[PDB]
């Protein structure tokens, strides 16, 4: 019964849904940050969503540890490092190179889309965790 809240939160996923970032990738972004933030609700949602959109079990189980795995592409790995360091903003400055490295795999407008995706899920993880979903 804060409907003004739920919809402010949907207006992000409404923009993301119009975003030129490929959906399998924003699902890896959502699933990975939900791992880091401990939203079990979000992890179960997007995990299955990613299944929906055709992800393999092998990559799904490797994302928890993607850094060490060959299963993700350079473009994926660059979005996953952005998402990892923006999830852990509490702990660290971002490394200076991160923005530059990102530009070697995404055009400027993809980066803003990547960034709203990661911000949107960081928001949702906080609603989930806070309300014991």
Phi-psi region of 94 (alpha: psi -120 to 50; beta: other; left: phi over 0): beta
Structure token pair of residue 129: 């965790």
Structure token pair of residue 107: 């055009």
- DSSP type of residue 66: G
Maximum separation of any 2 CA atoms in the chain, in Å: 45
Strand ranges, E, within the chain: none
Q: What is the DSSP string of 71-89?
A: SS-HHHHHHHHHHHHHHTT
Domain ranges in the chain? 1-133
Q: How far apart are the first and last CA of the chain?
A: 16
Method by which the model was determined: X-ray
Backbone angles phi, psi at 55, to 5 degrees: -90, 150
Closest CA to 13 of 121, 93, 103, 92: 121
Instruction: Identify whether the C-beta of residue 132 lies closer than 8 Å to the C-beta of residue 40.
Output: no
Q: Which long-range contacts (CB under 8 A, 24 or more apart) does 80-83 make?
A: 80/28, 80/29, 80/32, 82/114, 82/115, 82/118, 83/29, 83/32, 83/33, 83/114, 83/118
């Amino acid at each position: 019964a804060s409907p003004d809240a739920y919809a402010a939160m949907l207006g992000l996923e409404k923009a993301l849904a119009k975003a030129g970032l490929e959906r399998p990738l924003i699902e890896l972004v959502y699933l990975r940050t939900s791992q880091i933030n401990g939203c079990a609700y979000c992890v179960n949602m997007h995990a299955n969503d990613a299944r929906k959109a055709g992800e393999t079990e092998q990559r799904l189980q490797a994302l928890c540890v993607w850094q060490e795995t060959p299963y993700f592409t350079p473009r994926e790995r660059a979005a996953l490092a952005w998402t990892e360091q923006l999830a852990r903003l509490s702990q660290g400055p971002l490394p200076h190179g991160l923005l530059d490295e990102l530009r070697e795999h995404f055009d400027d407008k993809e980066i803003a889309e990547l960034t709203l995706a990661v911000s949107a899920i960081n928001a949702w993880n906080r609603f989930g965790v806070g309300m014991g979903m």
